[PDB]
Design a protein around this ligand. Structure first.
Ligand SMILES: *C(=N)[C@H](C[C@@H]1CCNC1=O)NC(=O)[C@@H]1Cc2ccccc2CN1C(=O)[C@@H](NC(=O)C(F)(F)F)C(C)(C)C
Ligand SMILES: *C(=N)[C@H](C[C@@H]1CCNC1=O)NC(=O)[C@@H]1Cc2ccccc2CN1C(=O)[C@@H](NC(=O)C(F)(F)F)C(C)(C)C
Lengths: 306, 306
């Protein structure tokens, strides 16, 4: 029993973190085989943050302008290139702790674990979601860029996020590991800001199933709803539309609990309209939306990873 | 910016997890140097769970009744002993990934990271607190026993919890790594149950300071309180008494924010009496009590670990 915001074990990623220095800027890099991946803004200087021309900045650099440190060991940079907003530094040494890995670009609403790092050293691990507005509600300070987000599947680390920027509302923006930003964001100091966010309906429903699995039914009711009438209510509460694909994805949790998806939707409708009237669900007074259906099955079934 | 329930990176602990089998029972063990630590109830059988005599059960066992598996490798048990409620299995191989480590028995209100494991394989990591009633609100299923809780300090893993039992309310009980239970609990199937819990006042105050550090002041007020008058209110809301030592411990957060501890206490008093009236603090509609003062300083200052 129990239900916690649960991250993946971080060891396979810890073994990949290094420190990258260019000029006076230091941040984190990801060392896989003989390549170190890091944010290209490591090559920026203070007076040219408004609209850097990264191609022009990078052509002026030499391999020896890049200092890569793994633990106490210096790695010599022997080549470099830029791919979108990431710099790829070829190093003289292959990382002997390279896990089996993939790079994946995730969809909004998907969750992942973040290994927050400073000066190439891991600080902590926490779970986040890609919000519908393609920001993440992270916990990041100066020097955290190059920290990555990931999922693990059997033995394989799927890297999906590298940290680059903090937006004026205190939320975070970054790239996939091929250097493409999530959302309409840029690695430059400009007026950019999170678009209006929405609540991830299919995840709220998954978490309500998690609550039932863990023994709590107080919020259920005898009603059902059509998908159309549910979505009419969802829209009113700034919830994302629920699609038939979402309904299909919730199939297993519905089958395990014996509660039809549209019946759980009627329960969610009542919670939106009535509130919780002083009660909690899985220790929260809010409707939680950063557990995917797969997250619930994982934690309520004890899946492991090697 | 940002504030998340943040666990320690788990890699140093992942390298220590093994699988222990006795008879038909399998659970997890902790492999440090040439010793594997695990719950002694691995030697129990189904029909003798009500009141096992562990000394009598263990004297009937041989080293070869214990199967220890690290990855795919079998470790041969060459000695065994019982210390309180933990079994110590001497193995023919020292763990080459043994981190620098200590065993610590923590006080109620302290937090730690849990590496939930099944069949010796890590599943996930999450943060918990030792509750005042010496239960933990974990997330644990069949086969999770032997999973450990820990803190990291520089390079040193301080193990403080090994998982043994689930209580009827769905909360969890276990031991320090010397096998002494936290709380009045036992490794036997008997009527035991969590005592009434309380809210960890000094942690709530720490989290309110975290909210101020992160830019949110809405809940502050112009009032102050005496410690005595605050505690009169705390008691009414099932909060633990705040001591002068707690006040001293909050000194740094008070100094960083410019808000005297007793002024923050007046803010907490108003929140207890008034509620939040639809507002949130750090993304919660409840007053969070599983961040210690040190947790706040760690995450708001970016301390790292090697
Ligand atoms: C990476 N080390 C750091 C992570 C930040 C620092 C505070 N919290 C975080 O998450 N990233 C930056 O400081 C980036 C880097 C950068 C590249 C090009 C141009 C300007 C910058 C400055 N950075 C910002 O994140 C700034 N934000 C913005 O400019 C914007 F809001 F995204 F537009 C700022 C937080 C104001 C420093
Ligand atoms: C360890 N693998 C497992 C962890 C449990 C299983 C479900 N959630 C958990 O956290 N621990 C047990 O199953 C223990 C072991 C044990 C030792 C001696 C005697 C009886 C048991 C059975 N266990 C229990 O946790 C049971 N709880 C209690 O007996 C009590 F409530 F604590 F009294 C029970 C969950 C009913 C199996």
């Amino acid at each position: 029993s129990g239900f916690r915001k649960m991250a993946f074990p971080s060891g396979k990623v810890e073994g990949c973190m290094v420190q990258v220095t260019c000029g006076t800027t230091t941040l984190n890099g990801l060392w896989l085989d003989d390549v170190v991946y890091c944010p290209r803004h490591v090559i920026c200087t203070s007076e040219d943050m408004l609209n850097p021309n990264y191609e022009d900045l990078l052509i002026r650099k030499s391999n020896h302008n890049f200092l890569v440190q793994a633990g106490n060991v210096q790695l010599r940079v022997i080549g470099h290139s830029m791919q979108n907003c990431v710099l790829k530094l070829k190093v003289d040494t292959a990382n002997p702790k390279t896990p089996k890995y993939k790079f994946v670009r995730i969809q909004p609403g998907q969750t992942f674990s973040v290994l927050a790092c400073y000066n190439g050293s891991p600080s902590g691990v926490y779970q986040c979601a890609m919000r519908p507005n393609f920001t993440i509600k992270g916990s990041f300070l100066n020097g955290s860029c190059g920290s990555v987000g990931f999922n693990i599947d059997y033995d394989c680390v799927s890297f999906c996020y590298m940290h680059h920027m903090e937006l004026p509302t205190g939320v975070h923006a970054g790239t996939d590991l091929e250097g493409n930003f999530y959302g309409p964001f840029f690695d430059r100091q400009t007026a950019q800001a999170a678009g209006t966010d929405t609540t991830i309906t299919v995840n709220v429903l998954a978490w309500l199933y998690a609550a039932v699995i863990n023994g709590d039914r107080w919020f259920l009711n005898r009603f059902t709803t059509t998908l159309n009438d549910f979505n009419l209510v969802a829209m009113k509460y700034n919830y994302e539309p629920l699609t038939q694909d979402h309904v299909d994805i919730l199939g297993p949790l519905s089958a395990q609990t014996g509660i039809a998806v549209l019946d759980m939707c009627a329960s969610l409708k009542e919670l939106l309209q009535n509130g919780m009237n002083g009660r909690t669900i899985l220790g929260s007074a809010l409707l939680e939306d950063e557990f995917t259906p797969f997250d619930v099955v994982r934690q309520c079934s004890g899946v492991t990873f090697q």
